[PDB]
Amino acid sequence: ARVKRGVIARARHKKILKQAKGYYGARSRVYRVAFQAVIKAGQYAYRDRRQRKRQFRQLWIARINAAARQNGISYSKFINGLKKASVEIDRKILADIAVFDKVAFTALVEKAKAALA
Amino acid sequence: MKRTFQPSVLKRNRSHGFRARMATKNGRQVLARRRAKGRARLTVSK
Amino acid sequence: AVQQNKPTRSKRGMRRSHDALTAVTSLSVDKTSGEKHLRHHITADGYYRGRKVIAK
Amino acid sequence: MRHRKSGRQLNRNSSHRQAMFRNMAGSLVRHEIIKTTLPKAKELRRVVEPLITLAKTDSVANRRLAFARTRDNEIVAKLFNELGPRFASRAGGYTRILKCGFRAGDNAPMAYIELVDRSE
Amino acid sequence: METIAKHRHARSSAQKVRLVADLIRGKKVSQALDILTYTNKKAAVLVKKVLESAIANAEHNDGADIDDLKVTKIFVDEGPSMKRIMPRAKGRADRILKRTSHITVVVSDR
RNA sequence: GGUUAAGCGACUAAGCGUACACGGUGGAUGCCCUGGCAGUCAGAGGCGAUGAAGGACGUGCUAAUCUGCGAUAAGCGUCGG
RNA sequence: CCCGGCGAGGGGAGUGAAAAAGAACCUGAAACCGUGUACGUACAAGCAGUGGGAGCACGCUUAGGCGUGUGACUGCGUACC
RNA sequence: AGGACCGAACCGACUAAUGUUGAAAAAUUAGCGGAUGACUUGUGGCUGGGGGUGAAAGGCCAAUCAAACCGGGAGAUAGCU
RNA sequence: CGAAGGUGUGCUGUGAGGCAUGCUGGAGGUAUCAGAAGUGCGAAUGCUGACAUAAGUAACGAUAAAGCGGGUGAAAAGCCCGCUCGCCGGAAGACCAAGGGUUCCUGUCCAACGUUAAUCGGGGCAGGGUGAGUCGACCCCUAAGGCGAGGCCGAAAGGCGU
Ligand SMILES: [Mg+2]
Ligand SMILES: [Mg+2]
Ligand SMILES: [Mg+2]
Ligand SMILES: [Mg+2]
Ligand SMILES: [Mg+2]
Ligand SMILES: [Mg+2]
Ligand SMILES: [Mg+2]
Ligand SMILES: [Mg+2]
Ligand SMILES: [Mg+2]
Ligand SMILES: [Mg+2]
Ligand SMILES: [Mg+2]
Ligand SMILES: [Mg+2]
Ligand SMILES: [Mg+2]
Ligand SMILES: [Mg+2]
Ligand SMILES: [Mg+2]
Ligand SMILES: [Mg+2]
Ligand SMILES: [Mg+2]
Ligand SMILES: [Mg+2]
Ligand SMILES: [Mg+2]
Ligand SMILES: [Mg+2]
Ligand SMILES: [Mg+2]
Ligand SMILES: [Mg+2]
Ligand SMILES: [Mg+2]
Ligand SMILES: [Mg+2]
Ligand SMILES: [Mg+2]
Ligand SMILES: [Mg+2]
Ligand SMILES: [Mg+2]
Ligand SMILES: [Mg+2]
Ligand SMILES: [Mg+2]
Ligand SMILES: [Mg+2]
Ligand SMILES: [Mg+2]
Ligand SMILES: [Mg+2]
Ligand SMILES: [Mg+2]
Ligand SMILES: [Mg+2]
User: Fold this and answer.
1) Do residues D111 and D28 make contact, with C-beta atoms less than 8 angstroms apart?
2) What φ, ψ does residue D54 adopt, rounded to 5°?
């Protein structure tokens, strides 16, 4: 029962080369290089599903700090005052409100200040 | 330079020719082997 | 002496970016015969400025 | 460097250069128009025109100098009996170089070099 | 109307012929014939023959004119390589490739 | 509106990249078997001085090679199909 | 029939179901080499991706922060055995 | 007279440079040694692998030599990579 | 009324994968459940073929040397003719042996071969060409040496030798 590999091997290599579209040079053309490129891309994507959550919170916090300091308070005191006021709004929403509704964020700041007062 | 092959047809045929092969039991077995392999040219000869 | 890595398609074409040929910018036109010719060269028919300079 | 130096080497030794321009000068005088490479034609001016200059004064010494420079007495005769008189009033410029394109075998820039009054 | 001519299996590397083919791409046909006449390359002899044939093809088979014809597409592909053996010092053999090329010119009016 | 100033600023691609389309090179893949592999059942188990095995040369309306043949030379006779 | 050198090669015409089956001939992958189009790229430093992400181009939809391609800028990041 | 002297052919190969993917798997160029002899050369012949031959270098025995080449034992064995 | 295969797309599964379908292709394919394996490759300085890179780079093989005119031709530095030039000349000339074997001559062709072009060629195709009593071989004679009737010797093969 002699088994030839051509059909399965072509399909196995095509699957990798399709995943490598857009990559520079041999990384999009050459299986040996493309397989390594696609694996490392998956390793990075796994890693960056985690870093994406760190990076966005880093961005949300930076915008809250900017908006808060424009309303006379640092991020750290603002987060504390909101905890003392039992506000459970998270960083993704506070940062969206800081940009898109600057009057509502100012109201959140005077609530935070009131709780520290 | 003088290279190793210096052709002489007399010496070619006395060393490796048909009758030189047929002269000995072991040369006759050379021809047998080359017949068994199906050699077109059994010997050097001509 | 020799390369430690295969240069790419790209670096090859960058080196060949100065290999393009220059087309002859314009051809001159003889006053007498109308022939196009290389400037300061005679025509195929043997004319030059307006003179037939070659026997044939 | 080559500052202020004249003479094309033409990838030859001196002796080949002298021999060939002697042959080329004779061939130009004989036929009055020759096709050659452009740098060889430009150097032939510096060989043929002093000959025609010398041939304006017919004297046994001058025919012998020309023979020394040509080694062909058909050329001496034509120089001294035809070209000397024809160019007796011309103050130089006995030759004309006509650029004529490029040679098939080597793409050498080619030129015709004429005597200026061929009148075939 | 797109009219095609090709020199297939031309004895020249595609790199060499591409130098010439890049001179006449997108040009009026009479202009291209002038450029090729005064381009000192063996490839310009090969490309001119193809362009001349495409022109005649366009007349004889595909219409008329000449003056409205432009070199719309011109490319040179690599053809099969002839493999030869160049001996080098110390019994070392070197397989030299004698590259060939397919030249194609597409002349067109519209 | 004009000038001047001061900010900011697209449009370049010699060439290169990625993607797509169309091609070239190349001859994988699939499909195919006049060829091979392994067996089973039966046969025949030797050829040769009545000149073998194997060859050389020749042989055609034939220039070559292959096959066949051997100066009766891709064939002769005879008996059968 | 036409270009071509009474070439090679090609374009037509015709044969054929098919010539994108034309003898370099079934299918015709990949590396590799090209043409064309879109986007990017000439103040920019590193495994060349990944996460984020404008702009541009291109197809949808009926507004709808959807698809495709490209990818400035930016976080992270020194291949495989 | 001469294993005499100088020196071409001829036989060699002391030095240098070139060459080192060479023009050449040992050469070229300039010089160098022998050059009537223990010389050199043609044609043929003999010596065969633990054997030959060796004015002896383990040298040479078909670009292979502290045991040639070819085929076989043979898919030696490989606690190693 | 379009099989395998090739090439895209879309969907789908935790994964190896699967399903559908456009295009190409033009005749095979195969559910299911079982069964058997030359059953899966990226590496082995792996093997074979193809194709890259360096790179249009080094090099084009003695530094005896070319120049012009004419001719032929699609095209001429290289072919033919001619005039000069230069090189060898105890050879780089001439006649052979050895070896090779048609490379000889003529016509014709220029794909490949020729380190370039080629109209030229020891290249391709075709045709022609080698004439012996005296040259040489064969032949007669032998050398070294070889084979060797019988023979002597030797497990066999064989060895030596008249
Ligand atoms: Mg012998
Ligand atoms: Mg030079
Ligand atoms: Mg050699
Ligand atoms: Mg461009
Ligand atoms: Mg591009
Ligand atoms: Mg099947
Ligand atoms: Mg027989
Ligand atoms: Mg034709
Ligand atoms: Mg095909
Ligand atoms: Mg193909
Ligand atoms: Mg910039
Ligand atoms: Mg850099
Ligand atoms: Mg002496
Ligand atoms: Mg020598
Ligand atoms: Mg010497
Ligand atoms: Mg002496
Ligand atoms: Mg020792
Ligand atoms: Mg040896
Ligand atoms: Mg040993
Ligand atoms: Mg055996
Ligand atoms: Mg082993
Ligand atoms: Mg592995
Ligand atoms: Mg290589
Ligand atoms: Mg370099
Ligand atoms: Mg260089
Ligand atoms: Mg060079
Ligand atoms: Mg040479
Ligand atoms: Mg022949
Ligand atoms: Mg001849
Ligand atoms: Mg040609
Ligand atoms: Mg050639
Ligand atoms: Mg011939
Ligand atoms: Mg005996
Ligand atoms: Mg006996």
Assistant:
1) no
2) -60, -35
Distance from CA of E35 to the nearest CA of C (A): 6
Q: Which residue shows structure tokens 């900017």?
A: A66
Stated length of chain A = 117
The CA distance from A28 to A26, in Å, is: 5
Give E1-110's CATH code, choosing from 3.90.470.10, 3.30.930.10, 3.40.605.10, 1.10.260.40. Answer: 3.90.470.10
Report the residue of chain C nearest D35, measured CA to CA: C54
d(CA E73, CA E106): 5
Q: Examine chains E and A and say if they touch (3+ CB pairs below 8 A).
A: no
Q: Quick one: which of E74, E109, E104, E106 has its CA closest to E3? A: E106
Distance linking the first and last C-alpha atoms of chain C: 56
Q: Which nucleotide is nearest, taking the CA of residue E89 and each C1'?
A: H22
- Dihedral through CA D54, CA D55, CA D60, CA D62, nearest 10? 20
> How would DSSP label each residue in C1-52?
---SS---HHHHHHHGGG-PPPPPS--EE-TTT--EE-TTS--TTSB-SSSB
Q: Show the domains of chain D with their CATH numbers.
A: 13-116 (3.90.1030.10)
Domains of chain A by residue range: 1-117
Measure the CA–CA gap between D75 and D65, rounded to whole angstroms: 12
Does C53 sit within 8 Å of D98, measured CB to CB? yes
Residue D65, C-beta contacts closer than 8 angstroms, at least 6 positions apart: D54
Contact C42 D120 (CB under 8 A): no
CA of B36 to the centre of ligand 21 (A): 29
Which residue of C24, C36, C48 is the best one to mutate when testing the D interface, meaning the one whose CB has the most D CBs within 10 A? C48
Closest among A14, A98, A13 to A64, alpha carbons compared: A98
Which residue ranges form the domains of chain B, and what is each CATH number? 1-46 (1.10.287.3980)
Give one DSSP letter per residue of D78-115, joined into a string: HIIIIIHHHTTT--S--EEEEEEEE-TTT--EEEEEEE
Residues with Cβ within 8 Å of residue A64, at least 6 apart in sequence: A75, A78, A79, A91, A94, A95, A98
**Method of structure determination:** cryo-EM
Task: Determine the angle formed by the axes of helices D14-31 and D60-70, rounding to 10 degrees.
Answer: 120
